Design a protein around this ligand. Sequence first.
Ligand SMILES: CC(=O)N[C@H]1[C@H](Oc2ccc([N+](=O)[O-])cc2)O[C@H](CO)[C@@H](O)[C@@H]1O
Length: 168
Amino acid sequence: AVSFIGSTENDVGPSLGSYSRPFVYDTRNKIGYQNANVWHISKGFCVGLDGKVDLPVVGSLDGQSIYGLTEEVGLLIWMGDTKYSRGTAMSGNSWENVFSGWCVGANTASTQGLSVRVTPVILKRNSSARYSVQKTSIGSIRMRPYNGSSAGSVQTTVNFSLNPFTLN
Ligand SMILES: CC(=O)N[C@H]1[C@H](Oc2ccc([N+](=O)[O-])cc2)O[C@H](CO)[C@@H](O)[C@@H]1O
């Protein structure tokens, strides 16, 4: 079996967080969303995750996209399984496999979770040397059943919004 237990709409990072330091900020996991329990799965269900970024691609760095927010500021983005170190670096605007997946035991119950993580990038330095960003939609993640498993009419997709932040 499978059922949806998480939230449909999800905020990434603390509201009006401020960060100091193309220039890439070391924000670690601060601008993130993580939830180990988004679908409940049981009895042989096999599942992975696809991710999709809806932001415009404005550049690239070491093989992944820089996604644009304003003219000063963009983002590097990772999506994946629950633990942050399993994040897949995102490129383009198509659905991408961001977790190869696993299968719960034939006689057990568990959960499937996810994570989204971003790091701010200064694309063009201003004169203000402080930069604000407002609440913006990032994209989505859907579960991907496999091995013949079926979602039935269970909700497959959840969405992410970047909370506003300031760069110093
Ligand atoms: C920790 C938890 O409640 N569920 C996690 C789940 O944790 C597991 C707990 C037990 C086993 N097990 O084989 O005994 C496997 C994963 O693993 C999934 C895939 O990595 C995660 O998406 C999910 O968040």
